[PDB]
From Swiss-Prot:
First and last residues shown, out of full length: 221 to 305 of 711
Quaternary structure note: Part of a ternary complex containing FUBP2, PTBP1, PTBP2 and HNRPH1. Interacts with PARN. Interacts with PQBP1.
Residues annotated as domain KH: 13-79
Localization (cell): Nucleus; Cytoplasm
Functional note: Binds to the dendritic targeting element and may play a role in mRNA trafficking. Part of a ternary complex that binds to the downstream control sequence (DCS) of the pre-mRNA. Mediates exon inclusion in transcripts that are subject to tissue-specific alternative splicing. May interact with single-stranded DNA from the far-upstream element (FUSE). May activate gene expression. Also involved in degradation of inherently unstable mRNAs that contain AU-rich elements (AREs) in their 3'-UTR, possibly by recruiting degradation machinery to ARE-containing mRNAs.
Sequence positions bearing Phosphoserine: 54
Homology family: Belongs to the KHSRP family.
Free-text note regarding domains: KH domains KH 3 and KH 4 behave as independent binding modules and can interact with different regions of the AU-rich RNA targets of degradation.
Tissue expression remark: Detected in neural and non-neural cell lines.
Stated name of the protein: Far upstream element-binding protein 2
Amino acid sequence: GQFHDNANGGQNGTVQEIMIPAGKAGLVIGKGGETIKQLQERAGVKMILIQDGSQNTNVDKPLRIIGDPYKVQQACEMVMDILRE
């Protein structure tokens, strides 16, 4: 977790919280969990998809993208793009 990977200007631990649509979550997870594994490694970040948190399991999904502010945003705009796609 080298948060200061490139442009960690400010808070090393930048958290991006997304609410993933119930069924469109399949995109962010990756049709079983393939894409999500890629997402973390491709951007060098950590994305916690609360899929098993329950309560809201039937609804929107709590996604916390944690890490460097520069890649956190790129990763946010990455998965949010798919979610607006």
